Homo-oligomer: 390 residues x 4
């Protein structure tokens, strides 16, 4: 954090040169009561490169900007086709571009960074183009603010391709300059439209991808001639899965993690659920880490049957978010009502009994389940719990 | 539905302020026979925030729009660089933007919503820019409609980057204003082109993706030097799969559902097929739910061989949509003709006989099949049908 | 094919009305020596709808275009704000749009179709806008070609947002018309740029995706500090796989086929290879169809070792495209040289011998292999070949 | 490399014709002291086609460009509507386009190639349009440089859609030409904006896709109400995986290789690790090639537990890049510290002992592991090591 202020100071120095140098080439009446900032800024540019550490095809912009190739032009009054090498300092902006595109490349969007850098370079180049236009004008008595204001008005009318045409070229050497900045204006405005069209194309990704996958599963299920009630129930399921976890599927988000982080996330999620069961209590610590990676999420809508009383039944369910209710076989007498953190279906792993009660959802549930075959497979390799459950 | 009319009333109030305030800053001859709508609209803005429920970095637009920071300007006749804070009411449009982008974010496309909101803000800002241009004109006797019509003509000629140039700036304080709205005009027109290019890029998704996957499997099969008859048959298969179910594959559409909805969809699809078989009749209800999730779809073209008489043969087929015919071993005597809802190949699960007849397709079929190994695997865990089939 | 000429005739009729009606509203000196084509075209429009077969929210454009709502205007000389309903015929273009977007929606690209239809509607609307501009001009003696040519020059200067400004509005009722077609011109030019940017964005798909996956596997393997010789060999492998089969992977192209077409493609590919082996000769026809679906493709570069003499060895290889050579254990005495259609490694399925010769590639091979476990798995369920190989 | 200079010479010849022919149609005072380059360039065009090897719908541009359809026009002084067929030579640019789009289609980006070719054709067409505009001018005494400079200024003002309007059409036959090049100017500028918007849309792919997958796994894990410490640890893991291997996952990059190249890459990666173990030393060469394809990469953050002392433990770990430390059961006495190239956990494959020490990471590790079941599965089919480990 003591070099970020140095990068800001270097940006201020090269910004200062980009605003000053084409303005003092046109008006040589400057630079004389303004040499001290040249001295300070030149020392900053010549002291940046040791603190930037020396010969590369990506170092010579800073190296050519470092040497005082100006101040000789302005003290010795070099003529017009030879003074222009005092723009060599403006190679410094490539270094500031390549530094600001990496010091904050993830604090912000990478497309918005390029667009703001382009708007900065377009204003900072419209200043230079206005200075050039004001340079190759007929010499006449005119106040030096109102003859810059017309040149900047011209070079904004040309670059933004509006083109009023109220002030136009007269001589041929103005017309050649006008042709070349019309090409540059069309190029810069094409780059601005291209970066805006790239920035707003990827602006909605999850909210467009979810709209696509709910149009796919609807235009398909209308082909199979499905009932409209069930189709409305599927559409409200996808509305739930958008307005809670933004459309993303649970088992493909946390597959993009490595094994220790995926284990840590599963340990944080199933935290206050697995310190409740009177089957895994007194078990080992290395047994919870084997069952907790094989839990699979399912989402039950309001009124769905999770367990029907009288089925064979295999697998146990852990409630994570929603509610559920437990009903008898006739669905008349309510036994109880379960909530988050609890669990049901535990009398199917250890025992070959058939289901004893009907478990209907009440709201959307987001509940995790553990299969019978998977539990008895990763129970075989731990012997003490293989004796503890018998 | 009694608050959606309130959102429409708030939109009408802030629309009213956005059309009125820059028009009454220019003409102070208004506001005196038009104060009652100021009173009504100010009460609406000051009563919206309790019915919007209080301090956040996303609440202060509505809070700054709520207080009557105008009406003091217009009753006390504040001067020109100080009256402009009566535009503080125009911060209300951020709240209406953020409300209309969520109350109907799935009734319509999310890109078309942004484009229509941008066109609304561009017209509603061209009004304010025309009022500003008409403000900093030389004062002269001119009817107040025809001097607004020229200012709006100017600010549409500038923002849509056409730029006739028939009426242009004269003073420097007009030229600075013209430079800044040329920048804003280029920005707004870049945003319009960017949103149109984003809206028409994703306009054909299924009809372009299907065109790509029929060009991939054609430019590949022309490398392998395949016969042109079979290549024409593959191309007409992909024409069938576009013009019936829009290109989407059956086993990857309904993998994006959870287990109860996928079970309900499979139960609705194989409804009038599984209450026909004299093998699964009298079976349990929990057995149909296990076989009905393991049916796999295949599509047979016209004239394809589904079953050849004399093969070993393993698996059973359920017809869902098309037709099929049953032929003898010499393919001369037609036994029968099957249709949708029926089934063939049932004498391969229970018995180790070889195929007894040749089953040729007639049109495209869309028929579901059940493997022998899968059926005998999920038949082992139900004992009563494991005795019923013996 | 006798209704496609009818669609072309209907397109010619509505094109005729779109070029004629705004030209005869301006000049009423027409229509009198040109009524017979009105009669013929009106009969075509009133006879299209029975041959188009009757009330829908997508049928009423053709129904409103069908009734002769003109010819009454032009015979009875209805005044200026009432004659304009003779543009109701121009609703017919929606029907021609919706017909031409489906009769040839796969003969051509779907984006190029929309772009050509947009260019057609933009020229066909610039005609109407030029007729309107020529309508609200001051009446003066001027030849009727050179006063249409200036109106069309104006409405192309405005719509393509160039805006010379050599001829401009004068009256207020011209200025309102100019504001509204400046908005339409900016919209049409935004749509043209959006469709061109959508048409050239997806223009290279396989040639950009392949460039991405050869930059991914290079920027990754430079992290692992891999040798440059092997990295050059991988890059020339990807150059081979572009310049033969356009980058696409063999086992994911023909997974997008159903089982009978995938079986037919594999039967056509391994045609002159499987009628050569003295192991599968005399075997059943239903055995070739089981082995021919389990062949897996691999590609060996020039000089790679396919088989090393003295290894354990399990699997057999079928050559499809390239060449290969067979060398002895010291790689000095060349046994033979194999070509396409032949096969090696056959003395590993039936026997537990170790490899007897070293098989080096010569060019790129594109050869298919069959594993030992897969062959002995799908050999167990056919008993007669399970006795034939013993 | 002796035909690339021929392609450059052909490009120079057709460039020469594209700059010369519309300039000599306007000025017939040329061609007389400039016939020798016509002779040389015509011989080059008539000798290219045998060295290009003869009748196709993609050969006739070169064939029509080959015959001297000019030089007869310029020696016999053909009149104005008949001289224009001397532009038939300009069909040669299609051949140069189709040759330069394939000789360097992978040295550079395919979109940048199309954009540079479009800028070349737009300048090279602005020359021809300026020559046509200068052709249909009123004949007057004016120096032949300053009347070309105004025509080129006009055709750059029109094509880049700026449109000053300082010089405009006068006659009708100029106005028809101006309408048609306004359409062409709008089309060319739409193509330039479309290619720039396509070139900058795909400019950041890996750096935008990685930003998306770290926003997905964050907006999901904020729904599950995860602790902020662990969420910060996941975000710094994704910062590591960007700033080392650019976001790409190890097991899906080298799945895009065939089996010999994937074997060669794994052999180069695990080179100085597998010639260290006192378990696989003295083993076969065909055993290293079977274990080295089943190594699976995992990445441990700083401070993670790789092995906990006292667990059951199954699998062995090979360190590739980072460091690690070995601690005792109380995590007080440090046994040693391991580095890259070494390995730990070897006393779990051969023996059923429980873990003997706790292995904590120090920095990010990038270490490869081998499961117990996989090792004992691919150890069963090699008998001599199955006796060597006992
Ligand atoms: C090249 C500009 C036109 C040069 C024409 C010129 O030299 O004019 C003579 C006077 O020179 C003179 O006083 C000096 C003439 C040149 C003074 C104007 C400098 C223009 C610099 C623009 C660079 C853009 C910066 C881009 C930053 C991203 C006469
Ligand atoms: C976004 C918002 C940004 C706003 C920046 C606007 C800056 C305005 C600062 C300029 C101050 C200003 O109002 O402009 C004139 C000064 O003339 C001058 O030479 C001014 C010369 C300065 C050059 C101005 C060009 C820079 C504008 C860049 C805008 C891009 C923004 C995006 C008016 O003079 P004033 O009324 O005293 O009477 C002059 C007398 O001769 C007749 O009345
Ligand atoms: C800033 C506009 C130029 C301000 C110049 C100005 O104040 O003019 C004086 C008169 O002021 C006056 O009567 C009052 C001058 C200002 C009256 C014009 C207000 C322009 C408001 C535009 C906002 C866009 C709304 C955007 C909505 C999305 C003289
Ligand atoms: C999309 C379709 C939208 C159409 C809206 C058009 C609104 C037209 C309403 C305006 C009514 C109108 O025709 O305009 C003039 C009124 O002048 C005026 O001050 C009118 C001043 C009102 C300001 C008009 C600008 C708003 C236009 C916004 C268009 C954007 C649409 C997208 C004509 O006067 P009138 O012939 O009596 O003779 C005037 C006399 O002095 C000489 O004949
Ligand atoms: C609305 C056009 C301006 C209407 C103004 C108008 O009616 O002018 C009067 C004369 O009317 C008259 O003779 C008749 C005036 C109207 C004659 C011009 C018709 C313009 C039709 C443009 C439709 C575009 C087609 C789009 C196809 C895709 C006076
Ligand atoms: C793409 C290629 C397309 C080319 C189409 C060009 C069509 C040209 C056909 C027009 C024929 C033509 O050359 O135009 C004039 C006729 O004036 C007229 O009223 C002509 C009026 C017809 C209206 C022309 C506008 C349609 C142009 C649409 C172009 C879009 C293409 C994309 C010249 O008259 P001419 O020299 O005898 O002397 C006239 C005398 O008064 C003075 O010399
Ligand atoms: C068509 C150009 C307008 C033709 C009009 C014309 O022929 O003018 C006559 C004189 O002809 C004459 O001397 C000769 C008139 C034509 C001389 C100008 C040729 C224009 C060629 C532009 C092609 C673009 C190249 C595109 C390259 C990609 C009078
Ligand atoms: C990107 C950078 C590219 C720069 C190319 C610029 C080329 C400039 C070469 C032209 C040389 C030049 O400066 O232009 C004039 C020559 O007039 C002429 O006929 C010149 C006629 C040549 C035609 C020029 C058009 C080509 C410009 C293409 C630019 C596209 C670049 C992207 C000035 O004459 P000069 O002062 O002696 O006094 C003339 C006397 O009559 C009054 O002083
Ligand atoms: N009286 C009860 N109170 C709370 N939960 C119950 C009760 N009876 C059954 N359950 C739960 O509901 C389940 C239904 O059958 P299971 O064997 O799956 O296991 C049962 C218990 O987990
Ligand atoms: N006479 C028949 N009528 C209708 N269907 C038949 C007839 N004979 C055979 N099939 C069906 O065609 C199938 C061909 O052999 P399978 O053993 O698969 O089972 C046979 C029956 O399902
Ligand atoms: N003399 C030979 N001529 C042609 N092919 C051979 C010869 N010897 C071995 N091969 C092939 O090369 C293979 C090397 O060992 P295999 O046992 O895989 O099977 C061998 C044969 O398929």
């Amino acid at each position: 954090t003591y070099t970020l202020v140095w990068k800001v100071w270097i940006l201020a120095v090269t910004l200062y040169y980009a605003i000053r140098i084409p303005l003092t080439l046109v008006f040589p009446s400057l630079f004389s009561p303004l040499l001290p900032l040249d001295i300070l800024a030149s020392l900053a540019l010549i002291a940046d490169i040791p603190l930037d550490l020396l010969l590369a095809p990506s170092r010579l912009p800073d190296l050519l900007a470092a040497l005082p190739l100006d101040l000789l032009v302005f003290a010795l009054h070099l003529p017009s086709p030879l003074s222009l090498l005092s723009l060599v300092r403006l190679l410094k902006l490539i270094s500031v571009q390549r530094s600001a595109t990496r010091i904050l490349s993830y604090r912000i969007n990478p497309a918005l960074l390029r667009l703001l850098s382009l708007v900065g370079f377009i204003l900072l180049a419209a200043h230079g183009i206005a200075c050039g236009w004001m340079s190759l004008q007929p010499p006449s008595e005119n106040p030096a603010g109102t003859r810059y204001l017309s040149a900047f008005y011209w070079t904004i009318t040309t670059l933004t391709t509006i083109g009023y045409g109220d002030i136009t070229p007269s001589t041929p050497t103005q017309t050649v300059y006008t042709i070349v900045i019309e090409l540059l204006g069309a190029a810069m405005y094409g780059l601005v439209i291209g970066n805006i069209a790239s920035l707003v194309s990827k602006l909605d990704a999850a909210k467009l991808l979810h709209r696509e996958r709910v149009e796919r599963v609807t235009a398909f299920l209308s082909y199979k001639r499905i009932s409209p009630e069930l189709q409305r129930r599927i559409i409200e399921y996808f509305d739930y899965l958008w307005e809670t976890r933004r459309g993303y599927e649970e088992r493909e988000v946390l597959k993009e993690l490595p094994h220790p982080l995926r284990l840590a996330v599963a340990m944080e999620i199933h935290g206050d659920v697995i310190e409740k069961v009177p089957l895994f209590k007194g078990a080992g610590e290395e047994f919870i880490r084997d069952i907790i990676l094989h839990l699979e999420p399912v989402i039950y809508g309001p009124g769905e049957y999770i367990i029907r009383a009288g089925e064979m039944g295999s697998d146990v369910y852990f409630i994570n978010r929603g509610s559920v209710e437990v009903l008898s076989a006739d669905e008349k007498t309510r036994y109880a009502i379960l909530s988050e953190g609890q669990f049901f279906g535990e009398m199917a792993l250890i025992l070959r009994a058939p289901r004893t009660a009907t478990v209907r959802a009440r709201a959307f549930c987001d509940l995790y389940r553990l299969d019978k075959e998977t539990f008895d497979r990763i129970l075989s390799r731990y012997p003490e719990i293989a004796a503890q459950i018998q």
